[PDB]
Each structure stands twice: as C-alpha cells, then as structure tokens.
C-alpha cells in the first residue's frame, strides 16, 4: 500500500513539508519533530519561531497553525 506520502513518494533524499518538518521539509532529528495534535504536521523544535529548546512535557501540543 506504500508509499505513505504521495507528495515525496517517501524519497528520503527529498525534502517534504507534508510528511517531514512542515517548516523546513527536513527529515533529520525525528525525536525533535513535534507532531501537532490537531493537523498532525511535524515541526522541528528548532524551526519553530521562537524555537523551543526542548520537546514539551505536556501530553498534547498544538502547532502555530492550530493555535
């Protein structure tokens, strides 16, 4: 049934703001890519403006586009 993303076809060498960092398109540091609990887009903590210096401890997190 793959690929999981039709925008990049899961090409790991291609940037993708749909399935990877929604800001930079980068796939690096998945452990630092927060997933929005509304839109399910991913955001590197360091791409956010302002940047977060660590992954939040709260269970839920909503990206800048969802509040």
């Amino acid at each position: 049934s793959g690929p999981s993303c039709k925008h990049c076809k899961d090409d790991v060498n291609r940037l993708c703001r749909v399935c990877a960092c929604h800001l930079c398109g980068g796939r690096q540091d998945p452990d630092k890519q927060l997933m929005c609990d509304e839109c399910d887009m991913a955001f590197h903590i360091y791409c956010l403006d302002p940047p977060l210096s660590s992954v939040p401890s709260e269970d839920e997190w909503y990206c800048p586009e969802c509040r």
Binding site: K32, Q33, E58, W61
Partner: peptide
Amino acid sequence: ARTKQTA
C-alpha cells in the same frame, strides 16, 4: 508531546 519518532 508526540514526536515523529514516537508516531
């Protein structure tokens, strides 16, 4: 919070 890693 969820991350790509835990998702």
